[PDB]
Design a protein around this ligand. Structure first.
Ligand code: RBO
Length: 167
């Protein structure tokens, strides 16, 4: 039993809710919140900008030190950093950004990072300002992630479309 509330069950291990991931993280304080990161961990907008703002920029400060030490992530890759006031840990995962021309096949590799964590609160990778089709992202999630994932979808209209079209 866990503390996630109001989710629709899509499969054995995938759950979905119309929710602001920032507000959901603040309330649940999950072990892991996933950030929709880029390779530079520059948290300017979308989910990343929102999560970073909620940490009062502490996420960005920590991320800048990480990059100065380790260099950029790979597209499809991830790193574990602090969850600050939102979660125990933040798993920064880089989905391909279609608006940069990155290969959508890398979306499966990106979701594979979730399998290293038993339970996660996450957005749909490569959705929103990353330019991929969120219906496709949900399909890849369901077909790739085997651990327990609670997906927060900010837009109510999109949430209803994702549920109604789910196979
Ligand atoms: O899910 C969707 O419809 C949109 C997807 C997923 N993203 C989010 N997901 C879940 N919570 C989110 N709070 C946010 C606050 C500010 C900006 C983006 C978000 C945001 C956004 C990018 O694309």
């Amino acid at each position: 039993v866990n503390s996630f509330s109001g989710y629709l069950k899509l499969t054995d291990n995938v759950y979905i809710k119309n929710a602001d991931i920032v507000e959901e993280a603040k309330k649940v304080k999950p072990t892991v919140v996933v950030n929709a990161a880029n390779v530079y961990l520059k948290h300017g907008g979308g989910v990343a900008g929102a999560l970073n703002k909620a940490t009062n920029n502490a996420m960005q400060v920590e991320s800048d030190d990480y990059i100065a030490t380790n260099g950029p992530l790979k597209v499809g890759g991830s790193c574990v950093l602090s969850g600050h006031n939102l979660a125990k840990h933040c798993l920064h995962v880089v989905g391909p950004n279609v608006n940069k021309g990155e290969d959508i096949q890398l979306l499966k590799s990106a979701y594979e990072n979730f399998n290293q964590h038993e339970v996660l609160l996450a957005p749909l990778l490569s959705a929103g300002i990353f330019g991929a089709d969120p219906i496709h992202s949900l399909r890849v999630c369901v077909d790739t992630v085997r651990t327990n994932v609670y997906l927060a979808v900010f837009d109510k209209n999109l949430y209803d479309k994702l549920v109604s079209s789910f196979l």
